[PDB]
Amino acid sequence: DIQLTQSPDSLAVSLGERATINCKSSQSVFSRDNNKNYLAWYQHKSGQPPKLLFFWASSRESGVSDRFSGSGSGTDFTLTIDNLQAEDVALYYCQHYFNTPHNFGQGTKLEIKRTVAAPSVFIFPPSDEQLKSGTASVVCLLNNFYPREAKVQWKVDNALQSGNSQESVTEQDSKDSTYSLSSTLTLSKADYEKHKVYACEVTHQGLSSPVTKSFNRGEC
Amino acid sequence: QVQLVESGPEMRKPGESLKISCKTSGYIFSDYWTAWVRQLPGKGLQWMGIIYSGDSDTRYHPSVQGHVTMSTDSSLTTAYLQWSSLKASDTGIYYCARLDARVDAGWQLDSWGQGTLVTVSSASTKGPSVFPLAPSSKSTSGGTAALGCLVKDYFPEPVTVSWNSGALTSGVHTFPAVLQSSGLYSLSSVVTVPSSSLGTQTYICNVNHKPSNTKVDKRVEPKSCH
């Protein structure tokens, strides 16, 4: 049983620069009989099936960008991406097929570095439909920011909230290399109607001061 | 052209049986193996094994042997993966992929199915409620309006969201679901559009939750006062 180990586990590389991902095999996967390394590289983008990049360690699958190249032999292998593009953001895997099982490496997460971009902030009161059901969700959207570290705080009539919100961040965008974040404050209809001002307060390194988006409940 | 198409998502209780399928077309079935690959939480792929339809010759990963079974229907050019008694920890995404069987060929996986999310839970299936996130002056600035749909209280994953039956894709963000304290999932899908055309364009989010056989189309209209 041959195992693969990749280095680094995660890598953040600037647009236009070179990305280097290494694969170390626990035993040689080089055959002196065939003069070939029994290794492949795959790309796995968010929401897509994995895609074959190289086989025999260095032979390029048709339709794969000439910016990509596979090298190495024996036990040490490298995937090189030159002139890094936004769409290269992905998980990358090596795999051997020397014997069974045809194990994959554990994966390397390639992240893209781009210029700082502050979030655009939007807020959504609860719909009248949902209010009819007896609950109220207030949604705050932080759109297209970089880097990923962004903070959201909820204030209701200027009082800081705790314990009644959840948030989720997107994967990194394949076109503009940003992130987006959604935060939801959830209350009973009864509690919601006990207050007037609902505010989302946003901190990010692209902002010199916190940005607040708010509405007054009932103001059309 | 060359295609591998897997069954839609599946939800079962522990102990139940399940067989998922991988329908292949666009190539000669007898010239290829079919591999099954499991996606691991966070990161990682596990090669589960392969099966050649020609004589149902099988390799298994030594740590999946005897718990799962691969088979083929060469008549249907289709491969199967089967559990006789599911456990909750079997939950996850499973891919099929084709592998050249020919003399000459390396055993790289050059074409892949879209993946099948199998969920094993004793919890009840529940379809989502879908609520509009209406564009208003509080989600409109700099010429841009944001709008979206809140998809709340469903189980299990996945929920699929498209906009205008797939014709609207740029600027869409469908967020990873969160797990509510209720054990139910919730997510939102949003899009940014010109604020100038809110009066002329129509925005509908199409929500699909196959485990509950739920399909919801929600027209998302700008907020007005009443």
Numbering used by the authors:
A (entry chain L): 1 to 27, 27A, 27B, 27C, 27D, 27E, 27F, 28 to 214
B (entry chain H): 1 to 52, 52A, 53 to 82, 82A, 82B, 82C, 83 to 100, 100A, ...
Give verbatim lines from the article.
Tau is a microtubule-associated protein expressed predominantly in neuronal axons and promotes the assembly and stability of microtubules. Hyperphosphorylation of tau is thought to lead to microtubule dissociation and assembly of the normally disordered, highly soluble protein into β sheet-rich aggregated fibrils called paired helical filaments (PHFs) that make up NFTs. Two unique tau binding antibodies, CBTAU-27.1 and CBTAU-28.1, which are both derived from the VH5–51 and VL4–1 germline families, were identified. CBTAU-28.1 Asp65 makes a salt bridge with Arg59 (HCDR2) and a hydrogen bond with Tyr102 (LCDR3). These two antibodies thus recognize a Pro – Xn – Lys motif in different tau peptides, where n is from 4 up to at least 7 amino acids.
By binding to the region that is critical for the aggregation of tau and which forms the core of PHFs, CBTAU-27.1 prevents aggregation of tau in vitro. Furthermore, the epitope of CBTAU-27.1 is specific for tau, and is not present on MAP2, a microtubule stabilizing protein closely related to tau.
